[PDB]
Design an enzyme around this catalytic site. Structure first.
Site, PDB file in Angstrom:
ATOM      1  N   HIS A 194      54.995  72.336  24.576  1.00 33.71           N
ATOM      2  CA  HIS A 194      56.247  72.898  25.079  1.00 33.71           C
ATOM      3  C   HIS A 194      56.268  73.341  26.536  1.00 33.71           C
ATOM      4  O   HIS A 194      57.328  73.669  27.057  1.00 33.71           O
ATOM      5  CB  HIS A 194      56.681  74.094  24.221  1.00 33.71           C
ATOM      6  CG  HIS A 194      57.054  73.727  22.821  1.00 33.71           C
ATOM      7  ND1 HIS A 194      58.322  73.307  22.472  1.00 33.71           N
ATOM      8  CD2 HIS A 194      56.321  73.702  21.682  1.00 33.71           C
ATOM      9  CE1 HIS A 194      58.350  73.038  21.176  1.00 33.71           C
ATOM     10  NE2 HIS A 194      57.150  73.270  20.677  1.00 33.71           N
ATOM     11  N   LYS A 224      69.298  83.041  29.430  1.00 39.53           N
ATOM     12  CA  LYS A 224      68.005  82.569  28.943  1.00 39.53           C
ATOM     13  C   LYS A 224      66.987  83.668  29.240  1.00 39.53           C
ATOM     14  O   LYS A 224      67.299  84.627  29.939  1.00 39.53           O
ATOM     15  CB  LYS A 224      67.602  81.278  29.653  1.00 39.53           C
ATOM     16  CG  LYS A 224      67.323  81.429  31.151  1.00 39.53           C
ATOM     17  CD  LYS A 224      68.346  80.650  31.971  1.00 39.53           C
ATOM     18  CE  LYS A 224      67.878  79.239  32.300  1.00 39.53           C
ATOM     19  NZ  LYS A 224      68.458  78.197  31.398  1.00 39.53           N
ATOM     20  N   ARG A 225      65.775  83.553  28.717  1.00 35.94           N
ATOM     21  CA  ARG A 225      64.784  84.594  28.983  1.00 35.94           C
ATOM     22  C   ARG A 225      64.573  84.750  30.497  1.00 35.94           C
ATOM     23  O   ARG A 225      64.737  83.789  31.256  1.00 35.94           O
ATOM     24  CB  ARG A 225      63.456  84.268  28.287  1.00 35.94           C
ATOM     25  CG  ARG A 225      63.478  84.493  26.776  1.00 35.94           C
ATOM     26  CD  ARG A 225      63.661  85.964  26.416  1.00 35.94           C
ATOM     27  NE  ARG A 225      62.515  86.762  26.835  1.00 35.94           N
ATOM     28  CZ  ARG A 225      61.468  87.050  26.063  1.00 35.94           C
ATOM     29  NH1 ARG A 225      61.419  86.612  24.816  1.00 35.94           N
ATOM     30  NH2 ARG A 225      60.471  87.785  26.543  1.00 35.94           N
ATOM     31  N   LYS A 255      62.588  80.184  35.964  1.00 29.67           N
ATOM     32  CA  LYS A 255      63.979  79.867  35.645  1.00 29.67           C
ATOM     33  C   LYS A 255      64.863  80.154  36.853  1.00 29.67           C
ATOM     34  O   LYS A 255      65.999  79.677  36.931  1.00 29.67           O
ATOM     35  CB  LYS A 255      64.460  80.689  34.455  1.00 29.67           C
ATOM     36  CG  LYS A 255      63.477  80.738  33.309  1.00 29.67           C
ATOM     37  CD  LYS A 255      63.939  79.883  32.162  1.00 29.67           C
ATOM     38  CE  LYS A 255      63.471  80.432  30.816  1.00 29.67           C
ATOM     39  NZ  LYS A 255      63.637  79.397  29.759  1.00 29.67           N
ATOM     40  N   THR A 276      67.182  73.906  26.140  1.00 26.89           N
ATOM     41  CA  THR A 276      68.099  73.514  25.066  1.00 26.89           C
ATOM     42  C   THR A 276      69.441  74.189  25.279  1.00 26.89           C
ATOM     43  O   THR A 276      70.465  73.707  24.809  1.00 26.89           O
ATOM     44  CB  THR A 276      67.570  73.880  23.659  1.00 26.89           C
ATOM     45  OG1 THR A 276      66.897  75.143  23.708  1.00 26.89           O
ATOM     46  CG2 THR A 276      66.610  72.802  23.154  1.00 26.89           C
ATOM     47  N   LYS A 287      73.505  73.144  24.788  1.00 27.56           N
ATOM     48  CA  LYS A 287      74.520  73.917  24.098  1.00 27.56           C
ATOM     49  C   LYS A 287      75.801  73.987  24.938  1.00 27.56           C
ATOM     50  O   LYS A 287      76.909  73.815  24.413  1.00 27.56           O
ATOM     51  CB  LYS A 287      73.989  75.319  23.794  1.00 27.56           C
ATOM     52  CG  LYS A 287      72.877  75.354  22.750  1.00 27.56           C
ATOM     53  CD  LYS A 287      72.165  76.698  22.765  1.00 27.56           C
ATOM     54  CE  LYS A 287      70.745  76.596  22.215  1.00 27.56           C
ATOM     55  NZ  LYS A 287      70.288  77.962  22.392  1.00 27.56           N
TER      56      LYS A 287
END
Ligand SMILES: O=C(O)CCCCCCOc1c(Cl)cc(NC(=O)NC(=O)c2ccccc2Cl)cc1Cl
Ligand SMILES: O=C(O)CCCCCCOc1c(Cl)cc(NC(=O)NC(=O)c2ccccc2Cl)cc1Cl
EC number: 2.4.1.1
Lengths: 816, 816
Positions: free
Chosen positions: B356, B547-548, B553, B655, B659
């Protein structure tokens, strides 16, 4: 089948589909993979379904009518299994029996799968459970309040003759009877400090633990009343138990929650013994603090607290919940802002205290430094209560300076302590003993000064047992033959058993009473080989002593008799003696060394006696493993001789004695506790009384107890002591029992030797009578027919009328 | 009402009585005192009742037909609420809506009462949940295996702009969906030592912890298939965890049970970060050990293990469950007594591994001393596996000594460690990436040596999301208008969304698509004031990045843009700019200092921007608190712009991006992870791509990244950095953000500055298009109509065919 109810056509059908509904939807199983445990649950949910309708209307009823509420606070509720008892009180037993039969299952086999709710140690906790049953049966608006321990009394295992303790994970597979109630969750405070402001004191900077309530239904006997037993569970708040920031670790903070929740983790396994551990004190305040908030919230609904005592009665089962007194004052004074005196008047009027023992080591004396740290405000309130109380004493007994220190709630010395019993007497409007002789001893000895100050507070309420679980449930056979002659009304009116006196000469009844006892013994003898394995003779006399292991209960005295019987047989092998199977069972608190040594002695005796070929089947010594409520329901109905041999003046009341009397056993005991009222009820001629009376014990203490004297004058006794000393009962470890022998000879607080001679002489008399079946049975009839006074329905009716101020009622609630 | 099913006359009636049955018998409440929480439970039990019939037959079915079983092992299953999802997959939504309506209740209000099953951190755990849904919908005999944490991902609270963590006690009030299964309880061993005897090694003197399974139903979409997710709970044995005698304390022994049970107490809150704590390793072995025993027991029923791989497939979700490999060998070799080679052949054939991430700090490298103490036999097996594997390497690459140390499962250095990823590749017959670019990077970089050794093992399986929860459930309005035109078959065949391409010029559809998005934004804007309070403008562009919180990110890059927008407005106040509401939400791991500093920066920006009168309603900066699955279901359908701006090559797949694409948002992002396949699917013209490609990042690393250069050449960037440095965003604490500025300038591993210019330039283009409603909506249609490839049904079908060797089937199981 018997009088376990009707097996109606419509109801057996209904029962079966509901059993199947649950097996499918609730257990998500199919007949194919269903385990007996699944079947037990399907039935449990099916039976529980029948009382929710009644539970709801009973509670709704009390809200509408708003009667005086009775709150029974106890840190112990020894309930046992609840499936059968519910069936019995709902008259569902036969219908359920029939339905499971048609489903191809054995109801009795499924019943054995239910785990005992062992949230009690012995007498004190079982009383609370019998009381709950009686309060429901008498239609009282009563609630049982306690702690929901996830681990009850440990399961006892015997390894190499020694007791091994193991965790009682009774919730492992789930509890179908309880209902969590997460809406009434409450916060309880600990530690902190007291700020004295302008308009009152404030308890500040406290650590908060939440109390989550779980309700269990308590159905009355066939009257459609279902009361509630509310048990508190400790839960950590999610905030501070994580939110008190500045390094430590997030994971650790979460794992540490199991620190505040340890409060309701396990029950203290001490019977009649005080252990001043902080965890215990926390449990005591926890149940008290949460219960009171709940009690006041209910009242606020139903703010002049003048009417509080007219709507509320809280009974203290021993001093365990004694913090209810200073806690009630705290709320009234600190929170509600009532003046001290008004607050105290209310508190004294709603509180009542029950004393259960007179042994000093059982007395609760909490070190002041402990209360000082954990409950700072409560200590202040206790000091203030003490101050005003002692002022009352000084005014009543001018110049009696020694009386003042004797009556103080605060004890000086090594470390200062708070005498919780003195607290209870001062803050309660009634103090009672649990048997006439115990109640008299309280007034003459232990609480003499308090009795002289306020004589009106002291009363007596002899204990009792519920005839539902202790007769109909465990002995349907006996209940049936009784019913064949006098009807069923006696189940909720035990006094009617007296009518059986007129069948004492009835040839058919004598044969029946004797037959059920025989069937009972055969079933127990079977169960013994089934689950424990190693044969016994059902034709012998079943001599049983079952209760917690204690020096005061004198299992040791029982041991000396057993060894005597053995030695006499070995002396004259070919002489006839009445065969006996003596069974001794009971748990010893884990830290009680002497009690654990006694269990090993019993098993050691059995090792010798049970394998001696000359003895044959004339004498077997068996130790009944893991004695608990469910096991009691099996042995008691099968017993012939009940052993109640505590030293006179030490057993407050006892209740096991009453269980045996109701089930057809004859009693051999001392004039102690309720034994006195039982012999007085049955007639001393129908009882096997022996030994010292309270006064003889005192006479002996004045002169001084010297065990050597007895050892010197009785050869048989001397022979036994020398057998223990030389390793006759412990070959590989010859000095194994030196502590027992040492104690017996030099520090026997309960004078075992003093009652030895009269005890074996009396045992000879019971053997003589057993040789005459007809007369033994006739005496048995005299005991059963005269046991009615010992129903908890009588005890409760007395508490209700003489302490709570409420009237019992046998009125059926308006259907379900 | 919509296509949430039929509201049949008979079924709405049936539903209502069952709702009332449960409210009465299950919740023991009466309409009078029922709380919305009671109503939620009555409904939950009523809906659950509808799938038990199907659950039973599905399981019975797999037993009879005996197909190959798929076992998905993961330490995370981010499930969220389950009431609505069950209604949807069972086509009960309308009937339930109608029935509760008639009962006078709002179904939507009750749904909000259900607690999220937050047993996951983010992407990895949500994938497992989407996969479970797809495996059921595709009729696969699959089981999800994990740990039943009593505390899932912490609840995030923002205090003074800072994140506060608090325990997620999701089981507080109970879980109506799970079913404890106390018959399959299993023992798991820890510590101990290895005895090498005559016929094999023996793992001895181990500490035993029990694993109790709880089953949760996983219903397929309208096909009557209900699979199972089995979660393990840790339980202490009652014996040794009490029976290891010789002083310590009975009470303490019982309280200490919460030591073995701490294993399943809490989920580690780390996203893409490795923490080598012992408790974590224990959880990993615990889930693996229990799962395997259960897998083999099932197989033994269905002893030649040659057929094992033909009936069993176990998928490893990351390296967390990697001990399954040496554990499978242990059982086969030590217990079943198979020869090493046969055992290894079986193991490799049944195991498959999914990678992952590629960031080093996320890689699991367990210190050897830890494995040595806790799992002695497993370490021996790992050494033996390594020995034989390296021999394979040496044989393939003679003399390549550096390749040997690079490929070793054992890493030398400070402390020896075991590279769990190398273990997985060696013991699995397939290794896959989660997006085409990530899978290529694995072959070219991280696992290059392994790829050269066995090229056939490496595959790709682009991630996906379930169109059921991520469309029909959260966006019924959009699902309905789509259905009005192309039917309902697309719910389980997302590729059919392409048919929407022919309505791209349809005037009615364009208006509808735009209308549902508007209704979605209005509802979210309302929810914002309802539960969090402080207004937003629903006419603005909803710019959301959820998101986290991670440096990779780049929420920070988003921050720089926000500050830029603000500074430009302050420069030319009366110039028109497209209004925007930028929402940033996400949780930061508790020990991640930088991530926590970023949350404070976001709230700090909002403090300045949201109260500047010159700005007006043109720009609001909002931090979305406690971002979780249930919150995602609300924001995503309301978003206009989806932020997927990670540094190229760092986000394996992502992901959330998928969405947003399915729900009508346009995407602004880098060519990273699945973003590449999404733009490739929709056409780059319909995507807002910017920044460096993977190769540009590498070029920059060769030359050397110097943030100063960017700071020097871009005045706008320089102005922002000087604002942060001088305390413009933190007046009372001027140096509050020095760590952020310091990092950005000297140790930015993710080159935020390098993509700044292209990022704000690209943001200008999205604002330009938003000014043209019709064209924005038409581009939106191009994205939705082209998102079909990203359904987890496609991903699963590929795993099934290319890895597990099973065939998916959309066949309805024979009714319930
Ligand atoms: O009944 C006998 O006499 C034994 C018959 C054994 C032969 C195979 C029978 O086939 C079955 C049958 Cl009939 C039923 C089941 N399963 C559930 O009932 N129940 C469950 O699996 C189950 C149990 C708890 C929670 C959730 C589920 Cl889905 C599973 C299978 Cl494989
Ligand atoms: O309904 C309204 O609109 C509120 C009406 C308030 C006026 C008093 C209503 O009288 C009631 C009624 Cl109707 C019902 C109840 N009680 C249970 O239903 N249920 C329980 O008490 C109960 C709940 C959980 C487990 C066990 C029990 Cl016994 C108790 C009382 Cl006092």
């Amino acid at each position: 089948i018997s009088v376990r109810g009707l097996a109606g056509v419509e109801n057996v059908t209904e029962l079966k589909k509901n059993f199947n509904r649950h097996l499918h939807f609730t257990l998500v199983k199919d007949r194919n993979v269903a385990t007996p445990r699944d079947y037990y649950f399907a039935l449990a949910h099916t039976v529980r379904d029948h009382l929710v309708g009644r539970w709801i209307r009973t509670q709704q009823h009390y809200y509408e009518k708003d009667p005086k509420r009775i709150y029974y606070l106890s840190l112990e509720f020894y309930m046992g299994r609840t499936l059968q008892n519910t069936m019995v009180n709902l008259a569902l037993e036969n219908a359920c029996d029939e339905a499971t039969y048609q489903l191809g299952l054995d109801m009795e086999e499924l019943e054995e799968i239910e785990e005992d709710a062992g949230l009690g140690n012995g007498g004190l906790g079982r009383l609370a459970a019998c009381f709950l049953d009686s309060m429901a049966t008498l239609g009282l608006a009563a609630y049982g309040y306690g702690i929901r321990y996830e681990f009850g009394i440990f399961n006892q295992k015997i390894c190499g003759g020694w007791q091994m303790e193991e965790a009682d994970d009774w919730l492992r597979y789930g509890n179908p009877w309880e209902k969590a109630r997460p809406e009434f969750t409450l916060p309880v405070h600990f530690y902190g400090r007291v700020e004295h402001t302008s308009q009152g004191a404030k308890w500040v900077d406290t650590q908060v633990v939440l109390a989550m309530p779980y309700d269990t239904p308590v159905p009355g006997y066939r009257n459609n009343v279902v009361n509630t037993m509310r048990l508190w569970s400790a839960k950590a708040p999610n905030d501070f138990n994580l939110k008190d920031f500045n390094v430590g670790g997030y994971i650790q903070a979460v794992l540490d929650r199991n620190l505040a929740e340890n409060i309701s983790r396990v029950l203290y396994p001490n019977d009649n013994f005080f252990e001043g551990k902080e965890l215990r004190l926390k449990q005591e305040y926890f149940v008290v603090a949460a219960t009171l908030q709940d009690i006041i919230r209910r009242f606020k609904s139903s703010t002049n607290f003048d009417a509080f005592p007219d709507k509320v009665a809280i009974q203290l089962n021993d001093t365990h919940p004694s913090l209810a007194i200073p806690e009630l004052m705290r709320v009234l004074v600190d929170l509600e802002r009532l003046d001290w005196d008004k607050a105290w008047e209310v508190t004294v009027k709603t509180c009542a205290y029950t004393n259960h023992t007179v042994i000093p080591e059982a007395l609760e004396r909490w070190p002041v430094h402990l209360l000082e740290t954990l409950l700072p405000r409560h200590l202040q309130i206790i000091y203030e209560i003490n101050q005003r109380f002692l002022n009352r004493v000084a005014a009543a007994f001018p110049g009696d300076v020694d009386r003042l220190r004797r009556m103080s709630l605060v004890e000086e010395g090594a470390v200062k302590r708070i005498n919780m019993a003195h607290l209870c007497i001062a803050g309660s409007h009634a103090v009672n003993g649990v048997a006439r002789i115990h109640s008299e001893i309280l007034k003459k000895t232990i609480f003499k000064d308090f009795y002289e100050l306020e004589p009106h507070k002291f009363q007596n309420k002899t204990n009792g047992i519920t005839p539902r679980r202790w007769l109909v449930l465990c002995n349907p056979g006996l209940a049936e033959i009784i019913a064949e002659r006098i009807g069923e009304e006696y189940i909720s009116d035990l006094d009617q058993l007296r009518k059986l006196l007129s069948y004492v000469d009835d040839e058919a009844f004598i044969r029946d009473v004797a037959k059920v006892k025989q069937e009972n013994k055969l079933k127990f003898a079977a169960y013994l080989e089934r689950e424990y394995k190693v044969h016994i003779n059902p034709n012998s006399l079943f001599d049983v002593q079952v209760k917690r292991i204690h020096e005061y209960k004198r299992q040791l005295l029982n041991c000396l008799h057993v060894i005597t019987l053995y030695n006499r047989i070995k002396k004259e092998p070919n002489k006839f003696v009445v065969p006996r199977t003596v069974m001794i069972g009971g748990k010893a608190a884990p830290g009680y060394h002497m009690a654990k040594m006694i269990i090993k002695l019993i098993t050691a005796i059995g090792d010798v006696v049970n394998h001696d070929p000359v003895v044959g089947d004339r004498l077997r010594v068996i130790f009944l493993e893991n004695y608990r409520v469910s096991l009691a329901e099996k042995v008691i109905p099968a017993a012939d001789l009940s052993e109640q041999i505590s030293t006179a003046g030490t057993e407050a009341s006892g209740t096991g004695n009453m269980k045996f009397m109701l089930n057809g056993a004859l009693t051999i005991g001392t004039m102690d506790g309720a034994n006195v009222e039982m012999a007085e009820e049955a007639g001393e001629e129908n009882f096997f009384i022996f030994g010292m009376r309270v006064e003889d014990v005192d006479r002996l203490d004045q002169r001084g107890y010297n065990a050597q004297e007895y050892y010197d004058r009785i050869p048989e006794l001397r022979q036994i002591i020398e057998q223990l000393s030389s390793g006759f009962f412990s070959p590989k470890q010859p000095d194994l029992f030196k502590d027992i022998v040492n104690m017996l000879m030099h520090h026997d607080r309960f004078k075992v030797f003093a009652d030895y001679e009269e005890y074996v002489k009396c045992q000879e008399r019971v053997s003589a009578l057993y040789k005459n079946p007809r007369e033994w049975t006739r005496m048995v009839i005299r005991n059963i027919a005269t046991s009615g006074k010992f129903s908890s329905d009588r005890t409760i009716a007395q508490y209700a009328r003489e302490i709570w101020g409420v009237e019992p009622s046998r009125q059926r609630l308006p259907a379900p």
